[PDB]
Design a protein around this ligand. Structure first.
Ligand code: 5RP
Ligand code: 5RP
Lengths: 217, 217
């Protein structure tokens, strides 16, 4: 879209931030704008948990206390973007962000508020390549296993995750049963995290639009 | 029980080694006797893939070439001990070994040869604590989910894995559906690897008995 639909979206999420709460925050241009609105009410927020280095440092600057996951038993909400989202509110995530961090913070939060522009909604997950984080000694193993499942895995070379794992971006899948494929990939030895958020998906999906931001609760 | 028994199981495994092959080798006292056996055949095999730092050293001193998992497309056999093993040949492993390492070599290998003394076979898995490797930031969350599954997770403090992950040793479970439980744990965000070898269990079980090795196939 334009930076303004993203921004319309990001600011519409501020309405789920209640007083005295600790806010799950994700990462991305759309969440950027959400962090901008969150700063306008820093005084009635206990603080935040972020799955992103950029967001954390931005929350800090704004004087928002940062929590770690092990300090909390739950989050009320986690606000975050998606790579793709289907009509069942299942998503591909982690293409351009810390996949493992996201999926953990999302797991701990009660409500997932997905904030997105017009380009993320799809009927069938998979045109956007699915990321899988992989123990490096297992990389060729996992790739073979992803092939068998009807993917074409491409090793994201020259980079690792903060933990030192590698990433395979899997192309060419027609992910008609995301919950199944999550299970299948999660069961391959050497898999760390898969970027299918199917068992746990979006709860509220906010889309940026020319005029304003449509909310699907 | 006795090392004589462990020794008996270890040497009994030599029989499964093909001239010219690259052998999957595991860890432990029983495995060391197998490494002894492999030695008497050094100049005749191609090399070994090891799941163990101590086993790697031992193979090297026999002049056996070390291959990494990324270097092979498969392994013929993987010979390894287990912490517990049921009548369905499903195993708890990783208790005092490189959990993730073992599960990956085990996945890549065609036949898993489990060498044990009399003390490893159990009726129901779970008296020995189930090791789960966990992303640090996920530890409390994953612990809370394992409790929901009927376990009492105990954080193995002072140590991390190679990967820099932590270990939860999970006591108190009656693991009467190992395939199911491995599915449930594998699907908790923040889990890296669980010490249930259930979907891929042992193909051959060698037990050292008071009356020689005994082979269950
Ligand atoms: O890569 C994904 C998560 O890793 C997301 O789609 C992205 O990080 C955030 O969305 P956007 O930049 O479109 O607002
Ligand atoms: O591969 C290791 C996993 O914990 C162990 O060494 C194996 O389970 C046990 O065999 P042994 O009783 O001789 O050590």
């Amino acid at each position: 879209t334009q930076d303004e639909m993203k921004k319309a979206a990001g600011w519409a999420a501020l309405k789920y931030v209640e007083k005295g709460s600790i806010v799950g925050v994700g990462t991305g241009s759309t969440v950027n704008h959400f962090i901008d609105a969150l700063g306008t009410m820093s005084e009635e927020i206990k603080g935040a948990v972020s799955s992103s280095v950029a967001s954390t440092e931005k929350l800090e600057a704004l004087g928002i206390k940062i929590f770690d996951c092990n300090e909390v038993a739950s989050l009320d909400i986690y606000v975050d973007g998606a790579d793709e989202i289907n009509a069942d509110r299942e998503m591909i995530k982690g293409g351009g962000a810390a996949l493992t961090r996201e999926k953990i913070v999302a797991a701990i939060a009660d409500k997932f508020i997905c904030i997105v522009d017009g380009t993320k909604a799809v009927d069938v997950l998979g045109t956007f390549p699915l990321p899988v984080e992989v123990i490096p000694m297992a990389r060729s193993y996992v790739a073979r296993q992803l092939v068998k499942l009807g993917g074409d895995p491409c090793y994201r070379e020259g980079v690792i995750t903060d933990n030192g794992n590698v990433i395979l971006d899997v192309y060419g899948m027609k992910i008609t049963n995301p919950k199944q494929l999550e299970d299948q990939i999660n069961a391959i030895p050497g898999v760390v995290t898969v970027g299918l958020f199917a068992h746990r998906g979006a709860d509220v999906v906010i889309t940026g639009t020319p005029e304003g931001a449509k909310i699907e609760e």
